[PDB]
Write a protein that binds this ligand. Structure first.
Ligand SMILES: [Ca+2]
Ligand SMILES: [Ca+2]
Ligand SMILES: [Ca+2]
Ligand SMILES: [Ca+2]
Ligand SMILES: [Ca+2]
Ligand SMILES: [Ca+2]
Ligand SMILES: [Ca+2]
Ligand SMILES: [Ca+2]
Ligand SMILES: [Ca+2]
Ligand SMILES: [Ca+2]
Ligand SMILES: [Ca+2]
Ligand SMILES: [Ca+2]
Ligand SMILES: [Ca+2]
Ligand SMILES: [Ca+2]
Ligand SMILES: [Ca+2]
Ligand SMILES: [Ca+2]
Ligand SMILES: [Ca+2]
Ligand SMILES: [Ca+2]
Lengths: 91, 91, 91, 92, 90, 91, 91, 91
């Protein structure tokens, strides 16, 4: 598989890894999203330490309004974060 | 780097491997997109062998209608392809 | 170690994670096999929830007729599931 | 994905890596199998140098006569090496 | 660095990792040796569950009688274990 | 496999890569030992350029008097060289 | 990621481990640089315990005159130390 | 060893692997430097396909003018790349 293909499997893996911890095994609840952001995105995002911050992140990602982040919402989240960090190269 | 962050860097790297070939070095033109798909997504997608199919993929991805795929749009494509793969893994 | 070499070791390690829980530490009994499948093959296989399903899985895997799955029989099951997954990535 | 599920995908991945280089993209020809063994099994197996050795491994693995190793045949190879490794280790 | 030189540094590093956990930072006391064996040699050695067993392992390794395993003593243990592994090719 | 276990296998691997050159493929003769030192211990040890230096190393290592270095004897050489290197990082 | 790539990220990570303790989270004040040296270079460098050694090291590393060590400046320190280590292995 | 110590040994190791191939075994000639960048900086850097690219990189790094990069000069390059990576993660 190419490196791009392996990158896509890794996105699915990390999602499974956190979404399967608690409750709904196919979505991230606020707590799981907090742990994903803090443990897996520490070079791209500041550590989330206040519930207002977890709440706004989740409010932003949660387009179906169920209070959780499903896989499609997580892919959009990754797209936003990666797009943002790639703007570094856009000058 | 986490495996998530490595995936994110891979996505940026592969995008540029193809985007910088011609014209705007931060967008994929149709020829660059065709090559990316054919060389980097050979296990997940059918090889593109017809200009018509190339036009249709770009028409689908090109959300801002500038005729090219920028990195935001490329992320949306990756998310679509990832999604297809993720379906295989929910049982 | 290469990714292949680590993968071979991971197959050994998972077999023993389960085989050593109960009874003979070198074989998977039904309950161990059910737990391995349910916990470690959840994205590749439907969860096993009924004794009758467990029984038929063991019956296919248990070639030598001792009522359990030994390492070699487990390697055959791994080759079966892997071949199934490999049929996916054919393009 | 579990460690087991990752290990299965890593088997598919390495197969692809070598099978797609030359000729039939869905099979390892002798040179492709040689490379895979020398680059990816370079801690479990001795480097294959002599052609005769390459020839013999392929004859071991090639069950359908076509002179190449397909994925199914490669999985039987993987089981052979994993078993050898299993016998190398302690389990008590 | 060759694969041999890198192996050597890895041996130094694992000894460091465990020798620094309690007491004398340069030696493995019995608890530290038990943990290294159980955490880092799980594919080559039986897990140690009994104190008799780790006392016996240390008695064997402990050539200067201080009741701990220093690095030179650790290298000897590594030599024994690797030589035993190698018996697989005998 | 742990880094320590990886190390142990590397040690077996290099020994065989040299021992297998000539004569007994399970032992290092003087020429093979010289080559191992010069090519694999180039950063820990001064290059051997003198027959007397070779002779001396082998006399030190060879404990069963066959005039060669088997694996067990090589492990003793490894212990010795590593130990000397460790003390160098010592507080 | 290659070993080189992972090593570069490890440099960023240890820097931040100590840089974020106090004050500017993006620079090392002398107390922080001291602790970094004392805790993460314990096998390469003798412990610093005198004001003047810290003062001396910081004056060497400080090129923009803020009395702190930013990440670029830290990289000159890393270069110095590593070059020093490389010289021990060249013999 | 700490993560920082191992990172430092990794930097010296990668230098040894590439500097050893051709000519002066203690320095990187331009072909060696191209190989290192293409093989070891492949996730962070663009592939060098145009010879004028290593030519200009060497131009900057060579400060004793043997037209090659020694370890010292190599560390400056590692600073430059690592610093860019830091700024990239700095958003
Ligand atoms: Ca959940
Ligand atoms: Ca939602
Ligand atoms: Ca372009
Ligand atoms: Ca567009
Ligand atoms: Ca059992
Ligand atoms: Ca059976
Ligand atoms: Ca082929
Ligand atoms: Ca090898
Ligand atoms: Ca065949
Ligand atoms: Ca201790
Ligand atoms: Ca002792
Ligand atoms: Ca020999
Ligand atoms: Ca002998
Ligand atoms: Ca600070
Ligand atoms: Ca400063
Ligand atoms: Ca050179
Ligand atoms: Ca690249
Ligand atoms: Ca120079």
């Amino acid at each position: 598989m190419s490196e791009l293909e392996k990158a896509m499997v890794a996105l699915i893996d990390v999602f499974h890894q956190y979404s399967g911890r608690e409750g709904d095994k196919h979505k991230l609840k606020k707590s799981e999203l907090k742990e994903l952001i803090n443990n897996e995105l520490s070079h791209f995002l500041e550590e989330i330490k206040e519930q207002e911050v977890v709440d706004k992140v989740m409010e932003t990602l949660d387009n179906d309004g169920d209070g959780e982040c499903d896989f499609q919402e997580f892919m959009a989240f990754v797209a936003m974060v990666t797009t943002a960090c790639h703007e570094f190269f856009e000058h």
